[PDB]
């Protein structure tokens, strides 16, 4: 049982679904008497595309701005290697998760 | 020239074809009994003081 | 322990964070003293919080300020705001506010903008700032 000081990164487009994942994940580890470090707030990355409305070029000239936003909220923990497998189970749609032992 | 000083006591609408001119009621501030009607070109508030080169012209309406 | 309080002043995009520590009457901004950090003609807009109040009221105060972002004249408006906020915040915490209320009332009577910021930003538009392109035949 050797601690490896794990770190977990998250990504999703929704904002409400992602937040409650961390809320239950921190509680799933806190009750197990594990020293947990806070849910840092990474910058939101917004990317946009602008294009002209008309498909032929006639008439007045008008554009529209599409948008897309991403949030991260990465988390890290100090725990053994095998225990962390059972703590990240039962995740819902939308949120993507990446595991790093950070040994 | 016997230039006279007057002070504004009331503003009465905006006249003119394009609203540039305004119509005010003035007070001679030396003989408080007399009062006439004049026209002014610029922005005007109550208790403003105006200078009159001649005091016998009056104005329409 | 040591008596200190932190205040900040803002402009369009100029942030001036300041820490006032009980000292001996020394004021320096970005390391350099007040002799340097300003355009020569704009140096006048830095001393007002002192003359209106008096140098005798800066007997044992030390101030260090770090400022970044914005422009030349925007920055000097931020730092002059931090000086006013530093002296009034330190007085509230550690000494009777009879000075502070007298400090606050006198300071804003000369100029309200010394203690409060002016909210102003730009507006995006699809023609430029606010004007459109030229028309051919109306």
């Amino acid at each position: 049982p050797k601690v490896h000081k794990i770190r977990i990164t998250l990504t999703s487009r929704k904002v409400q679904s992602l937040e409650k994942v961390c809320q239950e994940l921190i509680e799933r580890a806190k009750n197990k008497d594990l020293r947990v470090k806070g849910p840092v707030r990474m910058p939101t990355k917004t990317l946009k595309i602008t294009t002209r409305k008309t498909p032929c070029g006639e008439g007045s000239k008008t554009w529209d701005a599409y948008e897309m936003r991403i949030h991260k909220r990465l988390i890290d923990l100090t725990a053994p290697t095998e225990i962390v497998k059972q703590i990240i189970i039962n995740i819902e749609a939308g949120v993507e998760v990446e595991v790093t032992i950070a040994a | 020239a016997p230039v006279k000083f007057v002070k504004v006591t009331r503003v009465l609408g905006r006249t003119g074809s394009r609203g540039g001119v305004t119509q005010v009621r003035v007070e001679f501030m030396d003989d408080t009994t007399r009062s006439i009607i004049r026209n002014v070109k610029g922005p005007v508030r109550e208790n403003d003081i105006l200078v009159l080169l001649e005091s016998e012209r009056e104005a329409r309406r | 322990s040591v008596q200190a309080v932190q205040v900040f002043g803002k402009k369009k995009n100029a942030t001036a964070v300041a820490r006032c520590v009980q000292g001996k009457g020394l004021i320096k901004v970005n390391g350099k003293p007040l002799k340097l950090f300003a355009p020569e003609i704009l140096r006048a807009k830095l001393y007002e919080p002192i003359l209106i109040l008096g140098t005798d009221k800066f007997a044992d105060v030390d101030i260090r300020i770090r400022v970044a972002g914005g422009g030349h004249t925007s920055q000097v408006y931020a730092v002059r705001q931090a000086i006013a906020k530093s002296i009034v915040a330190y007085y509230a915490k550690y000494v009777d506010e009879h000075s502070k209320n007298l400090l606050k009332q006198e300071l804003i009577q000369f100029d309200r903008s010394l203690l409060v910021a002016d909210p102003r930003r730009c507006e995006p538009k699809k023609f430029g700032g606010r004007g459109a392109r030229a028309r051919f035949q109306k």
Binding site: - | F5, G16 | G25, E48, Y77
Partner: protein, 199 residues
């Protein structure tokens, strides 16, 4: 210590300009007060005010600020207020040596004298003009006086060996009295003359 030795000279006395005090203001006329603001002194004119939100809010503003802003025009000089403040300060020194009076003493009398008192208004006559020769409000008088003084200096210094520092200075002393050889006086009397005809 923390302040330069120069400013320690004035801190003991009443607050004032770089050199000149706003005390001993003229007693010459009426109807021009309440629109030229000198009760609140300013060290340097430059200020980020809120004078363009209401009707008469800009009436409560130092005249030097009003003069300084109007000095920068004609495309090239847009937003270059730092240059304008330097010109005003240097011009104020030039007039001081040629006349023992205060530089603001000259500037105030220049404005109060070059403001037209009557003007002709445009009333349609189906292609003709029924100029009625209306009166002028005090606020417009000071606003138009500033424009006349500044545009005269800007015209003279164009393609001239002289600089705007003293071209502006020489007009103010000219406009202090009835010199009649200044740009402002030439236009002011011309406007009043045509108004009399259309009475």
């Amino acid at each position: 210590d923390v302040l330069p030795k120069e400013v320690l000279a004035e801190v003991g006395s009443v607050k004032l300009f770089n050199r000149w005090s706003y005390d001993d203001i003229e007693i010459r006329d009426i109807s021009l007060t309440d629109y030229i603001q000198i009760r609140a002194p300013v060290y340097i004119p430059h200020s980020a005010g809120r004078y363009a939100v209401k009707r008469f809010r800009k009436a409560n503003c130092p005249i030097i600020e009003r003069l300084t802003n109007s000095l920068m025009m004609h495309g090239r000089n847009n937003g270059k207020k730092l240059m304008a403040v330097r010109i005003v300060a240097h011009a104020f020194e030039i007039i001081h040596l040629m006349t023992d009076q205060n530089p603001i003493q000259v500037a105030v009398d220049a404005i109060v004298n070059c403001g037209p008192r009557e003007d002709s208004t445009r009333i349609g006559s189906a292609g003709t003009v029924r100029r009625q020769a209306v009166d002028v409000s005090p606020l417009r008088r000071v606003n138009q006086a500033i424009a006349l003084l500044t545009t005269g200096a800007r015209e003279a210094a164009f393609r001239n060996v002289k600089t705007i520092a003293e071209c502006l200075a020489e007009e103010l002393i000219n406009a202090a009295k009835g010199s009649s050889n200044s740009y402002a006086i030439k236009k002011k009397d011309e406007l009043e003359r045509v108004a009399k005809s259309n009475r």
